Amino acid sequence: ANPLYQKHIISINDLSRDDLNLVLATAAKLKANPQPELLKHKVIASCFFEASTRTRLSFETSMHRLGASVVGFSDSANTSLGKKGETLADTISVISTYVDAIVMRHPQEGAARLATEFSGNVPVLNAGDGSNQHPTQTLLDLFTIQETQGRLDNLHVAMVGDLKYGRTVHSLTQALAKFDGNRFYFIAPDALAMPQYILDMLDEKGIAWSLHSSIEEVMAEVDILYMTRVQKERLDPSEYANVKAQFVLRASDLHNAKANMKVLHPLPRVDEIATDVDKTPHAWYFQQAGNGIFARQALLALVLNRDLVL
């Protein structure tokens, strides 16, 4: 069967270099020659115990462009499961008798992994579990880095913002550290820096990384600028408004960038990327969100189909 056939997709840590490449390969084929009746007669459950409109619609549009049916829910001040008394384990034990696959996003970490022990042979795919993991965002980021830069190794990647708590930046570094020769520049407020564990990992593999103070310091060498949003909740309004003469991106700042330099952002991009960046060649966050469709279609097709000869 294909390597990922009937597999659970919970952590980027559990998918090897080749599994990542397999996904990215399939997604490039599904982008090219669509197959809209591939999951005809499958029913997938879209269990968003935590609400994400953008992520839920990317997933359900993925389910539907491969012809699958969808049952599910989202939850803010609403609809029953969990309540208190109803265990996650019993929700999954009950929903595993109804569906063919479970995509779920939950606020506590490891909820997707707990689920895997109750879904029987029904695959479960993680769409977010607290501050732990979000594999399908990493998968679409790497597909966007591969189709714009041409490769996934030997890249000069700049990571910016709340590096301490952007869950997508912790995953993306783990994954880009399975390919070879990548150099990392980490521009964060020191209140919001890369944890020592990411850094401690990167040195065992021998990867080169550096920490800078503002994007202007690396604009000239960088291929991917991955911008993250700085979270006003865990910052004082006065601290937040104080850092440097900022770390937001404007087209003036880009006058130095390489021609193939692209700016990525998992979104939402409230104010760290100004509207004038949107019209430059380097802006790629919306094209990045469209590639969510192809990355998610690839994962669902490999999980639910034994052999895909596309």
Binding site: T87, L88, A89, Q108, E109, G110, R113, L114, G130
Partner: protein, 153 residues
């Protein structure tokens, strides 16, 4: 049967002797590893006077041979214990513990948003980095903590 006495108590007819338990880990070990839920005679010696630690604890379980990875779950609490296996009054075997690769069920994830708290699953930690000081990663939330910290609460 042979001359027990009690500063160092004697001979069980076949079974396990976990000797050289540091002071006050003995009861903890009976609690955590539920060693008491047997109908076998267990004899336990607590705050005892010997083998240089000075005072040690000791557990004797007749007719049960708990081994190889059972002996290793003991490593985080009682690393210098010896687990003597006995048949017909002779110590036909002496093991010590080594860090296991996985410690199930006995620990509690210190991360409060971990899902493990609320549910019909047991805890599981991946163990690593011998005697310079152990890190434990939760199976579920994948947060790596210092063993000192999980072992406090």
């Amino acid at each position: 049967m042979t001359h027990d006495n009690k500063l160092q108590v004697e001979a069980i007819k076949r079974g396990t002797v976990i000797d050289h338990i540091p002071a006050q880990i003995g009861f903890k070990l009976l609690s955590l590893f539920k060693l008491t839920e047997t109908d076998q005679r267990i004899t336990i010696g607590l705050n005892l006077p010997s083998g240089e630690m000075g005072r040690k604890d000791l557990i004797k379980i007749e007719n049960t041979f708990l081994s190889e990875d059972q002996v290793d779950q003991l490593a985080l609490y009682a690393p210098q214990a010896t687990v003597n296996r006995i048949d017909n009054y002779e110590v036909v075997g002496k093991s010590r513990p080594s860090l296991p690769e996985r410690i199930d069920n006995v620990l509690v994830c210190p991360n409060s948003n971990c899902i493990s708290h609320a549910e019909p699953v047991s805890s599981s930690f991946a163990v690593r980095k011998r005697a310079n000081d152990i890190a434990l990663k939760c199976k579920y939330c994948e947060k790596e903590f210092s063993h000192n910290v999980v072992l406090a609460n």
